[PDB]
Design goal:
Blueprint (H helix, E strand, L loop, with lengths): L7 E3 L4 E7 L11 E7 L6 E9 L4 E9 L9 E2 L10 E7 L11 E5 L7 E8 L13 E7 L5 E9 L4 E2 L6 E8 L5 E9 L4 E10 L2 E8 L8 E9 L4 E8 L8 E2 L7 E9 L8 E2 L22
The structure holds copper (II) ion (CU).
């Protein structure tokens, strides 16, 4: 917190580093989520091509989002209040002991410009010793940006459930998500799963001509970082993306709805060739419910915490 680093560090003619660091916060109670924003210093298009975590020891988890309207203009805030008022687009997730895993060579997220995010929003989640004379913490992430066009553009394919209810006691409830893919090819290289306490497992697949290829499979009670996809999965025009979240209602007194409460989110991080690329994409439907009768057995086997 006596760093001399400077928020923008020029690197060479076309690149700069952005240091995104909590402005000296004091985590009070445990499980505390703090948020801060950082404006891109350029107006034109740039590419985020690398990330370096600068985490304290006590930092459990960090997320980085791109958006155009952070939820506060304050120095920092509590993320309970929200991340961005507009769509918060996840770019990066770090968890202690997870390998955060790198952007592949030639891949960048596109920001700035007419259609790219104007701000980053950083979230830092703290795990706290009750002495320390109000310790100041400046955890965060350094971001590497370039104005040199990248050949491959990263983006997020967000699958989410909204139609499903968990009746009390049911032990096993499936929430299924599926959409037809109709863009240029995307190549999936990482995934993140999100659910609250009732989630057991979250699985994502590419389905082509009735054959299922796993994108990724994880227990959402583990740290919600981005996990790497072993061998990147090409998703192409005509494929279906399918995801299933497995819930419990055991110990529940009343029904639980999948709506912010429970959630079934699968973040599929991809790249696409630059000239055909888009930054986002979402599925919020179950268009092919019948196909889940053929889902691989593995999508139902638990992954204990
Ligand atoms: Cu949630």
């Amino acid at each position: 917190c006596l760093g001399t680093i400077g928020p923008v560090t020029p690197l060479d003619a076309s690149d700069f580093a952005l240091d995104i660091r909590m402005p000296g916060v004091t985590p009070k109670e445990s499980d505390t989520y703090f948020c801060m924003s950082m404006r891109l210093p350029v107006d034109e298009e740039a590419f985020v091509i690398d990330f370096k975590p600068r985490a304290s020891d006590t930092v459990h988890h960090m997320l980085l989002f791109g958006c155009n309207m952070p939820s506060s203009t304050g120095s920092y805030w509590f993320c309970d209040e929200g991340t961005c008022t507009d769509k918060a687009n996840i770019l990066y997730a770090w968890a202690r002991n997870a390998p955060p895993t790198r952007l592949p060579k030639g891949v960048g997220f596109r920001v700035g410009g007419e259609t790219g995010s104007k701000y980053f929003v950083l979230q830092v989640a703290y795990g706290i010793s009750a002495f320390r004379d109000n310790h100041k913490d400046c955890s965060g992430v350094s971001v590497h940006l370039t104005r040199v066009p990248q050949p491959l553009i990263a983006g997020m394919y967000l699958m989410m459930s909204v139609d499903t209810v968990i009746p009390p006691g049911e032990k096993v409830v499936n929430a299924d998500i599926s959409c037809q893919y109709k863009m240029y090819p995307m190549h999936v290289f990482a995934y993140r799963v999100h659910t609250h306490h009732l989630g057991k497992v979250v699985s994502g697949y590419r389905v082509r001509n009735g054959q299922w290829t796993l994108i990724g499979r994880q227990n959402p009670q583990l740290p919600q970082a981005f996990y790497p996809v072993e061998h990147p999965v090409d998703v192409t025009f005509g494929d279906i993306l399918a995801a299933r979240c497995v819930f419990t209602g055991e110990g529940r007194t009343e029904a639980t709805h999948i709506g912010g409460d429970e959630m079934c989110n699968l973040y599929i991080m991809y790249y696409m060739e630059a000239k055909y690329a888009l930054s986002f994409m979402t599925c919020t439907k179950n268009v092919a419910p019948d196909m889940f009768r053929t889902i691989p057995a593995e999508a139902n086997i638990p992954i204990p915490v």
